[PDB]
Write a protein that binds this ligand. Sequence first.
Ligand SMILES: CC[C@@H](C)[C@@H](NC(=O)[C@@H]1CCCCN1C)C(=O)N(C)[C@H](C[C@@H](OC(C)=O)c1nc(C(=O)N[C@@H](Cc2ccccc2)C[C@@H](C)C(=O)O)cs1)C(C)C
Ligand SMILES: Nc1nc2c(ncn2[C@@H]2O[C@H](COP(=O)(O)OP(=O)(O)O)[C@@H](O)[C@H]2O)c(=O)[nH]1
Ligand SMILES: [Mg+2]
Lengths: 430, 67
Amino acid sequence: MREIVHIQAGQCGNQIGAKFWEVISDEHGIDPTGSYHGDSDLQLERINVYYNEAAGNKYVPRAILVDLEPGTMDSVRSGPFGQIFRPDNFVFGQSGAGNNWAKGHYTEGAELVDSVLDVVRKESESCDCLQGFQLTHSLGGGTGSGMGTLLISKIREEYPDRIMNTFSVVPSPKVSDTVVEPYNATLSVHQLVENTDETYCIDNEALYDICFRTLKLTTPTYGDLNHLVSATMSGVTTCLRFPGQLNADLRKLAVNMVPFPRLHFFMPGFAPLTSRGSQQYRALTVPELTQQMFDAKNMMAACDPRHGRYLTVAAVFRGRMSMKEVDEQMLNVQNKNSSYFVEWIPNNVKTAVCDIPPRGLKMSATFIGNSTAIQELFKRISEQFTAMFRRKAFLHWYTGEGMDEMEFTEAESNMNDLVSEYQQYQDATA
Amino acid sequence: KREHEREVIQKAIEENNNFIKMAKEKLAQKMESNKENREAHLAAMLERLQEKDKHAEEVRKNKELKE
Ligand SMILES: CC[C@@H](C)[C@@H](NC(=O)[C@@H]1CCCCN1C)C(=O)N(C)[C@H](C[C@@H](OC(C)=O)c1nc(C(=O)N[C@@H](Cc2ccccc2)C[C@@H](C)C(=O)O)cs1)C(C)C
Ligand SMILES: Nc1nc2c(ncn2[C@@H]2O[C@H](COP(=O)(O)OP(=O)(O)O)[C@@H](O)[C@H]2O)c(=O)[nH]1
Ligand SMILES: [Mg+2]
């Protein structure tokens, strides 16, 4: 139908992206060759949102794979689904960005970005009605972060009236010891506040605590983290990929979720939480899904929801279940907790049910919340940023690429202003 | 934004070029100044020694000037 172009950038972006393609490919009965082999037509109705149709009855993901180094792309070419991507849609350089946003945004990323844009253009042109773009990347490295945000800025220039959507992985010192990640993240957030329409915040700190505390994994790997990411991505794009009423395209989603243009950062949530392989013998009940998906322990961003207020919430239930019961359980959650929901956006929780459950589950639920408690994540990045920046530590890696300190002070300011806008709405009354 | 991106890479290039230029300059002034100092220090050592030759002809002349 209305086509979405997908771009994945950098190691993280390409790992989570690959993983998304595997998962939704299986949800739509498309196998590694591009051949459909399923038993429903719900699978094919809105396939064109994410797949182009090749002759021979083949489906090619509408996906562009970008990095400044070859590593993760030889690795994706030879993943399970690797042979599925169009080959001139792999765009890669040779030297890598060394976890430096300035290199990604200004010097090396600069070199490669016109080649990416040509592939994007080519994919656009062959779309009947393009809805827009979605990007997977982390904010704490150099390619996903600095190049990925350079891309967004260039795509916005050529396509100023399409929706831009990202899946932005937020860094945490529980997962990474690279010291400049708060610099890259703050510079990136600055770009995201200006140039995206929706951003899903996937917080490495949240994923790690989920894995450790709840899934009881003593030594989580990235693969463990990414398993939670891909469940989530599958969940949040359900409404775009199946027939339905609510949030069925990117623009309808943004009008339901974004009351003020800057506060477009979302907390996703998910139930049930599971670890790879290990087995799901008991289906959850509609009351369990409902309590779990609003649990703080099920949020992919480490924010405490009781610390803020929901401006808007979209909830998605999957698998065959009682719509009547979904309805009572949702009403029950809002009525029993009415004060976490801003009285000045009436009826701000929307609910969808899709009949097809995700692989290996009889049922799940995905939550997407625009909560003021997301300020906590920005505050954490800001505190890490300021501790270094007030002494100008590590700056020479950035100015050696031509950046000025001013650019840093601006990013910091824009982000401090974001945090206070969320605070203003947490306290607004009616 | 696109004009700014251009300035930044330009500034990078400029600062790198300037680092090289200054190093070339400082290297060449140090070399020629070291060359001069070393020449002087050897010129003076040799002329001191030349003055030993003048004085030794002067001592021998003075001898044969005694009758
Ligand atoms: C030497 C110590 C690192 C291994 C380790 N520790 C740290 O980085 C430090 C140590 C001391 C200070 C605070 N912490 C943050 C770590 O566990 N890290 C970085 C992991 C990530 C790391 O973990 C391990 C145990 O290998 C990695 N995971 C993978 C991984 O998932 N690789 C998969 C492929 C892959 C996937 C994504 C990205 C790269 C590779 C392969 C398969 C088996 C899988 O799916 O699990 C590669 S490196 C978590 C914090 C997320
Ligand atoms: N969840 C997750 N985080 C990742 C993955 N790979 C890297 N990261 C995190 O991403 C940040 C570094 O970004 P990365 O994508 O490797 O750099 P890039 O290739 O320059 O974009 C650090 O916070 C890493 O912990 C991944 O596969 N999954
Ligand atoms: Mg990398």
